[PDB]
Design an enzyme around this catalytic site. Structure first.
Site, PDB file in Angstrom:
ATOM      1  CG  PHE A  41       3.288  -8.453  -8.175  1.00 12.37           C
ATOM      2  CD1 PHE A  41       3.576  -9.177  -9.349  1.00 12.37           C
ATOM      3  CD2 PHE A  41       2.071  -8.638  -7.568  1.00 12.37           C
ATOM      4  CE1 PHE A  41       2.649 -10.134  -9.893  1.00 12.37           C
ATOM      5  CE2 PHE A  41       1.136  -9.563  -8.059  1.00 12.37           C
ATOM      6  CZ  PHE A  41       1.425 -10.336  -9.215  1.00 12.37           C
ATOM      7  CD  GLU A 108     -16.069 -14.375   3.638  1.00  8.04           C
ATOM      8  OE1 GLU A 108     -17.183 -13.963   3.230  1.00  8.04           O
ATOM      9  OE2 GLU A 108     -15.805 -15.580   3.873  1.00  8.04           O
ATOM     10  CB  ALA A 111      -9.990 -16.095  10.983  1.00  8.42           C
ATOM     11  N   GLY A 112      -8.587 -18.884   9.528  1.00  6.27           N
ATOM     12  CA  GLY A 112      -7.970 -20.154   9.909  1.00  6.27           C
ATOM     13  C   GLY A 112      -6.549 -20.508   9.436  1.00  6.27           C
ATOM     14  CG  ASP A 153       0.029 -20.753  -8.254  1.00  6.32           C
ATOM     15  OD1 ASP A 153       0.968 -21.606  -8.331  1.00  6.32           O
ATOM     16  OD2 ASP A 153       0.125 -19.713  -7.570  1.00  6.32           O
ATOM     17  CE  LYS A 155       1.692 -21.275  -4.706  1.00  8.21           C
ATOM     18  NZ  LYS A 155       3.062 -20.675  -5.128  1.00  8.21           N
ATOM     19  CG  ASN A 158      -1.899 -20.286  -4.094  1.00  7.00           C
ATOM     20  OD1 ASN A 158      -1.090 -19.687  -3.372  1.00  7.00           O
ATOM     21  ND2 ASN A 158      -1.848 -20.241  -5.422  1.00  7.00           N
ATOM     22  CG  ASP A 171      -2.021 -15.931  -5.893  1.00  7.52           C
ATOM     23  OD1 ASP A 171      -2.260 -15.273  -6.948  1.00  7.52           O
ATOM     24  OD2 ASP A 171      -0.861 -16.075  -5.455  1.00  7.52           O
ATOM     25  CB  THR A 188       4.276 -23.371  -7.734  1.00  5.04           C
ATOM     26  OG1 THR A 188       3.725 -22.110  -7.407  1.00  5.04           O
ATOM     27  CG2 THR A 188       5.285 -23.837  -6.600  1.00  5.04           C
TER      28      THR A 188
HETATM   29  C1  LIG Z   1      -8.674 -13.831   1.114  1.00  2.00           C
HETATM   30  N1  LIG Z   1      -8.795 -13.720   2.551  1.00  2.00           N
HETATM   31  C2  LIG Z   1      -7.712 -13.920   3.250  1.00  2.00           C
HETATM   32  N2  LIG Z   1      -7.769 -14.027   4.587  1.00  2.00           N
HETATM   33  C3  LIG Z   1      -6.684 -14.235   5.340  1.00  2.00           C
HETATM   34  C4  LIG Z   1      -5.452 -14.332   4.670  1.00  2.00           C
HETATM   35  C5  LIG Z   1      -5.397 -14.188   3.277  1.00  2.00           C
HETATM   36  C6  LIG Z   1      -4.113 -14.360   2.533  1.00  2.00           C
HETATM   37  C7  LIG Z   1      -2.801 -14.626   2.923  1.00  2.00           C
HETATM   38  C8  LIG Z   1      -1.931 -14.836   1.845  1.00  2.00           C
HETATM   39  C9  LIG Z   1      -2.545 -14.761   0.610  1.00  2.00           C
HETATM   40  C10 LIG Z   1      -2.101 -14.877  -0.793  1.00  2.00           C
HETATM   41  O1  LIG Z   1      -2.925 -14.876  -1.726  1.00  2.00           O
HETATM   42  N3  LIG Z   1      -0.788 -14.978  -0.931  1.00  2.00           N
HETATM   43  C11 LIG Z   1      -0.223 -15.473  -2.169  1.00  2.00           C
HETATM   44  C12 LIG Z   1      -0.104 -16.993  -2.136  1.00  2.00           C
HETATM   45  N4  LIG Z   1       0.146 -17.559  -3.453  1.00  2.00           N
HETATM   46  C13 LIG Z   1       1.124 -14.767  -2.193  1.00  2.00           C
HETATM   47  C14 LIG Z   1       0.933 -13.306  -2.620  1.00  2.00           C
HETATM   48  C15 LIG Z   1       0.840 -12.965  -3.960  1.00  2.00           C
HETATM   49  C16 LIG Z   1       0.695 -11.621  -4.336  1.00  2.00           C
HETATM   50  C17 LIG Z   1       0.647 -10.639  -3.370  1.00  2.00           C
HETATM   51 CL1  LIG Z   1       0.461  -8.925  -3.774  1.00  2.00          CL
HETATM   52  C18 LIG Z   1       0.711 -10.941  -2.049  1.00  2.00           C
HETATM   53  C19 LIG Z   1       0.842 -12.268  -1.697  1.00  2.00           C
HETATM   54 CL2  LIG Z   1       0.936 -12.561   0.053  1.00  2.00          CL
HETATM   55  S1  LIG Z   1      -4.266 -14.411   0.753  1.00  2.00           S
HETATM   56  N5  LIG Z   1      -6.532 -13.991   2.565  1.00  2.00           N
END
Ligand SMILES: CNc1nccc(-c2ccc(C(=O)N[C@H](CN)Cc3ccc(Cl)cc3Cl)s2)n1
Lengths: 337, 20
Positions: A41, A108, A111-112, A153, A155, A158, A171, A188
């Protein structure tokens, strides 16, 4: 002691849990740079906070899409839980607000990249590499479970990898504060405990099973149960027969046999000794849990970096203009957000 | 090999959450 540190962690959580932050920013304070991932979503975007120059990851959740997946309570849980918790291995929610169209959670920036991406690329992790990550999950769950939260969740997708090679758990879409048993079939497929698939009603022990799936995937380079369709996967989990790769040590096989256990009177994490059944296992003999919490253990892998708002550790996604409608959508559904 | 079977499956990409 853990007991006493957890005590004071609980008191900290409950204050925030009872009196949640709301509406602490607005979309126009942030400049939006790149999409870092997409979900049911919405998306997550690298953004820059204009008046500080601080980079953040901004999760944008389409309210209409949320409503049609029946995830309203789930989304309120996520934001309610994320503003209240505080632990080294969990993403930090800095700001949250909403507009006519969307919810927003500003966290926050990590970056990795995701564990998933480094794990697929290199194939599998060495047991010491896999153990360094596991330890951090072991502690995070001991934290969350102590606040009566179930995560639901786990995996590699995440687990975000920071500048120092440490994990941030992202997440919380299915995390839930619950003292008794709960029933929602969510998670999942590769990671579902057999009691979820079987609609028995279940508890925090599903997180300990999910830890077994992850340790196994990290060390084998694939999960203990896979097939092309979910239904095929559920049959394998319900049989529950696991084969271990010839390269798995004895200790790893044994730790896994106790995590990937159908019998709940028998599953590690869930017994009388609780988490110490895991922490004192032989596979973790080398682990210094305190140095792990303190972040003083040298990471087996430091992601490559090139600067402040660098995104090369993440995949590329097709951008999409953020549209905010001129009418308010689902007001009453998301009142408390 | 199990590896080769995984690599050849349709479940090596990022895996969607399910509900029901
Ligand atoms: C928190 N700081 C930070 N820094 C760099 C990158 C990221 C993320 C990249 C994907 C993410 C995520 O939670 N994705 C979910 C994985 N289960 C998938 C998801 C679920 C809902 C929504 Cl709205 C968007 C996404 Cl990508 S969080 N976060």
């Amino acid at each position: 002691s853990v007991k006493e540190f957890l005590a004071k962690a609980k008191e900290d959580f409950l204050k925030k849990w009872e009196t949640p932050s709301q509406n602490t920013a607005q979309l126009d304070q942030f400049d939006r740079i790149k999409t870092l991932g997409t979900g049911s979503f919405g998306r997550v975007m690298l953004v820059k906070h204009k008046e500080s120059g601080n980079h953040y990851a901004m999760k944008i959740l389409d309210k209409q899409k949320v409503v049609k997946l029946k995830q309203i309570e789930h989304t309120l849980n996520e934001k309610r839980i994320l503003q209240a918790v505080n632990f080294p291995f969990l993403v930090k929610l800095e700001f949250s607000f909403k507009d006519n169209s969307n919810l927003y959670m500003v966290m926050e920036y990590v970056a990795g990249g995701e564990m998933f991406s480094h794990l697929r690329r290199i194939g599998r992790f060495s047991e010491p590499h896999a153990r360094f990550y596991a330890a951090q999950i072991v502690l995070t769950f001991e934290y969350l479970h102590s606040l009566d939260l179930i995560y639901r969740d786990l995996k590699p997708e995440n687990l975000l990898i920071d500048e120092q090679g440490y994990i941030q758990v992202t997440d919380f879409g299915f995390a839930k504060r619950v003292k008794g048993r709960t029933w929602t079939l969510c998670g999942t497929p590769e990671y579902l405990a057999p009691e979820i698939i079987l609609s028995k009603g279940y508890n925090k022990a599903v997180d300990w099973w999910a830890l077994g799936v992850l340790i196994y995937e990290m060390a084998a380079g694939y999960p203990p149960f896979f097939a092309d369709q979910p239904i095929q996967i559920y049959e394998k989990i319900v049989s529950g027969k696991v084969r271990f790769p010839s390269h798995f040590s004895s200790d790893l096989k044994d730790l896994l046999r106790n995590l990937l256990q159908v019998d709940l009177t028998k599953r590690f994490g869930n017994l009388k000794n609780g988490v110490n059944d895991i922490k004192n296992h032989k596979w973790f003999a080398t682990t210094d849990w305190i140095a792990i919490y303190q972040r003083k253990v040298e990471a087996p892998f430091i992601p490559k970096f090139k600067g402040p708002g660098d995104t090369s550790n993440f995949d590329d996604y097709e951008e999409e203009e953020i549209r905010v409608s001129i009418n308010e959508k689902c007001g009453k559904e998301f009142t408390e957000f | 090999t199990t590896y080769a079977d995984f690599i050849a499956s349709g479940r090596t990409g990022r895996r969607n959450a399910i509900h029901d």
